[PDB]
Coordinates of C-alpha atoms in Angstrom, one line a residue:
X1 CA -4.1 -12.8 -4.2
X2 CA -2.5 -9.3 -3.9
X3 CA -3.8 -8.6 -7.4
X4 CA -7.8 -8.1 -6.4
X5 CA -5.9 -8.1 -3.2
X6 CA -3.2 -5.2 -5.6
X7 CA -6.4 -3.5 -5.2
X8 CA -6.3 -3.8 -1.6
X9 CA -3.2 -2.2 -1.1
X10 CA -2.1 -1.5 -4.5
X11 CA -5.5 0.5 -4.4
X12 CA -5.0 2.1 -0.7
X13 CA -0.9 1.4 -1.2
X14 CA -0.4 2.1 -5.0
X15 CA -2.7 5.1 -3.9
X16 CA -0.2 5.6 -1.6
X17 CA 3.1 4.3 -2.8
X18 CA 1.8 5.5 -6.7
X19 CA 2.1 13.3 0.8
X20 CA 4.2 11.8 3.7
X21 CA 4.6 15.9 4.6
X22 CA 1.9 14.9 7.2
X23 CA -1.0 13.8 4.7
X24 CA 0.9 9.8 5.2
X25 CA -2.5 8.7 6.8
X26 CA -4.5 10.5 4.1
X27 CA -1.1 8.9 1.8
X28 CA -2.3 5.0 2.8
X29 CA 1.0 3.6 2.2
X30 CA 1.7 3.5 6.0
X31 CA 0.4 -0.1 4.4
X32 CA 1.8 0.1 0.9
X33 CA 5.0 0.2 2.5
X34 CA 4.6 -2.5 6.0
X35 CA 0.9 -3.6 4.4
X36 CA 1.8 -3.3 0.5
X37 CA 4.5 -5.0 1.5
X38 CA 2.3 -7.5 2.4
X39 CA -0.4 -7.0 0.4
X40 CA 2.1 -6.6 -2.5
X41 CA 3.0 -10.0 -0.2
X42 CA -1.1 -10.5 -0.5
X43 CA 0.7 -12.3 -3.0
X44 CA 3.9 -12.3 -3.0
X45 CA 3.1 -14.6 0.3
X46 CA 5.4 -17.2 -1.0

C-alpha cells in the first residue's frame, strides 16, 4: 500500500525526491530513490 505507505516514503521520499549537496540524509530519498523505489514499490510490489 505505497499510498498511506506514499506517505511513508512519498512523505520521507516525496520529501525527498519532491539537498543531495550533503543534506541527502536530512533529503530522505536515500529511500525515495532504493526505499521510494520500493515504497513507491510499497505498492508498486507487483
Amino acid at each position: 500500500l505505497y499510498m498511506a505507505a506514499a506517505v511513508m516514503m512519498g512523505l520521507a521520499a516525496i520529501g525527498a525526491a519532491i539537498q543531495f549537496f550533503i543534506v541527502m540524509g536530512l533529503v530522505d530519498a536515500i529511500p525515495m530513490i532504493c526505499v521510494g523505489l520500493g515504497l513507491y514499490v510499497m505498492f508498486a510490489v507487483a
